[PDB]
Design an enzyme around this catalytic site. Structure first.
Site, short mmCIF file in Angstrom:
data_model
loop_
_atom_site.label_atom_id
_atom_site.label_comp_id
_atom_site.label_asym_id
_atom_site.label_seq_id
_atom_site.Cartn_x
_atom_site.Cartn_y
_atom_site.Cartn_z
N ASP A 80 -12.97 4.70 2.98
CA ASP A 80 -11.51 4.76 3.11
C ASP A 80 -11.15 6.16 3.56
OD1 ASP A 80 -8.75 4.58 2.95
OD2 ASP A 80 -8.71 3.45 1.04
N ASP B 257 0.86 -1.17 0.00
CA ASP B 257 0.00 0.00 0.00
C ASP B 257 0.90 1.22 0.00
OD1 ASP B 257 -1.90 2.13 0.59
OD2 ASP B 257 -2.20 1.41 2.60
N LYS C 224 2.26 11.23 -3.95
CA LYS C 224 1.08 10.59 -4.54
C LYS C 224 0.08 11.60 -5.11
CE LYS C 224 -2.33 6.93 -3.45
NZ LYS C 224 -2.61 5.92 -2.40
N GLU D 110 -7.06 0.22 -4.69
CA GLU D 110 -7.17 0.12 -3.23
C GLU D 110 -8.49 -0.45 -2.73
OE1 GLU D 110 -6.02 4.08 -2.29
OE2 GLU D 110 -3.94 3.77 -2.91
#
Ligand SMILES: Nc1ncnc2c1ncn2[C@@H]1O[C@H](COP(=O)(O)OP(=O)(O)O)[C@@H](O)[C@H]1O
Ligand SMILES: [Mg+2]
Length: 377
Positions: A195, A7, A68, A172
């Site tokens: 999430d 991850d 990211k 994800e």
């Protein structure tokens, strides 16, 4: 050969391996299972993870995070130009592509976002080799379901640069569903993935039919996460310190950083305790700051942020054209979903339906990726 599931998080990164019918979320040699997505550059060294995070206040312009948010994007992208106003490091244009520019060993260097992320991936690789005692090469790496091919390709490129063989880039929320075996349960299954990480909030509705995953809808807030809740605590304590000592610590970057770290740790404690202590020696002008905060106060400081997470849930359901009662499984992902009030709000919204939360939510993506890596290896 061992294959790992990674991850590569916006703020924290995790690496697991499926061995002997169990997933191990791998600890580093200081016992910690997570690696902040931070890289720092100094006169003498490159620092990764907590080593980089721990010196950010003394070295802000050469400490890089949030890669990211840049990876796979072009320099003139609206979101890049928007995000650059909040970062203390420089982002420059190289022929359309954003690069982070830093000073490193006395020289000016620039890095593509995927080179920054590859440095975080290099550490994850080394952590897994420290645990396994073997060379680690194959990996599955996760991305947000809304990532486009450029962002996926750039994330794979970070793996390659790190020396990883990236078997597959997977979403994800799919990793999270896989971690709970939701593709192995019958008819179509409607799954809501909720999430909430350190910097971003993602809601996804997947439908799984005959073991095929289809993303039906996504929603959320790209700039809402645990750090916003920490922010509210920091402001609360800056105001308390001022009221008790007639002193404003806001402009002492090191003091605020130490307060922020204490707040993040208090927040985590409040997920399992109804109170948490703040203990900081010499916070400002020689003044210790020993105080506490209750769970109720933490919830009050953040009440609108918590309640508002339900609006992206409603939107995702409207876009998937499902009623809330048509959700078969609700999966909690990201460290922020350990907050009892967020769990209560979500379970209430689903009329008491039990949440999938037995897998540490901040670990569920790496867990699922590790399972997928074993399947593909
Ligand atoms: N027990 C806890 N209670 C509340 N928040 C937590 C807890 N554990 C971790 N968090 C928060 O989760 C967030 C990071 O989540 P994670 O999924 O691990 O990172 P990323 O943002 O990279 O997805 C951080 O804001 C962190 O403070
Ligand atoms: Mg996460």
């Amino acid at each position: 050969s061992p294959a790992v599931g990674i991850d590569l998080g916006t703020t924290y990164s995790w690496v697991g391996v499926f061995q002997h019918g169990k997933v191990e979320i791998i600890a580093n040699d200081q016992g910690n299972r997570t690696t902040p997505s931070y890289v720092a550059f100094t006169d003498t060294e490159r620092l990764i993870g907590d080593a980089a995070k721990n010196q950010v206040a003394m070295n802000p312009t050469n400490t890089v995070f949030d890669a990211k948010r840049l990876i796979g994007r072009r320099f003139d992208d609206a979101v890049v130009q928007s995000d650059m106003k909040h970062w203390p490091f420089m982002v420059v244009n190289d022929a359309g592509r954003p690069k982070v520019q830093v000073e490193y060993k006395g020289e000016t260097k620039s890095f593509y976002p995927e080179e920054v992320s590859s440095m975080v991936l290099t550490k994850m690789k080394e952590i897994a080799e420290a645990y396994l005692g073997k060379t680690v090469t194959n990996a599955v790496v996760t991305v947000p379901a809304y990532f486009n091919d450029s962002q996926r390709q750039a994330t794979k490129d970070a793996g390659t640069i790190a020396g990883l063989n990236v078997l597959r880039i997977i979403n994800e929320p799919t990793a999270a569903a896989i971690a709970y075996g939701l593709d192995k349960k019958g008819a179509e299954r409607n799954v809501l993935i909720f999430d909430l990480g350190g910097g971003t909030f993602d809601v996804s509705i997947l439908t799984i039919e005959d073991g095929i995953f289809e993303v039906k809808s996504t929603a959320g807030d790209t700039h809402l996460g645990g750090e916003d809740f920490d922010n509210r605590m920091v402001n609360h304590f800056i105001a308390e310190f001022k009221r008790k000592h007639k002193k404003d610590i806001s402009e002492n970057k090191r003091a605020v950083r130490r307060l922020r770290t204490a707040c993040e740790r208090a927040k985590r404690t409040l997920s399992s305790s109804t109170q948490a202590s703040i203990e900081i020696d010499s916070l400002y002008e020689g003044i210790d700051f020993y105080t506490s905060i209750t769970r109720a106060r933490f919830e009050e400081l953040n009440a609108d942020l918590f309640r508002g997470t339900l609006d992206p849930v409603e939107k995702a359901l409207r876009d998937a054209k499902l009623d809330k009662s048509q959700i078969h499984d609700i999966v909690l992902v990201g460290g922020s979903t350990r907050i009892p009030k967020i769990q209560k709000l979500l379970q209430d919204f689903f009329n008491g339906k039990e949440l999938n939360k037995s897998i540490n939510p901040d670990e569920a993506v790496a867990y699922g990726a590790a399972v997928q890596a074993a399947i593909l290896s």
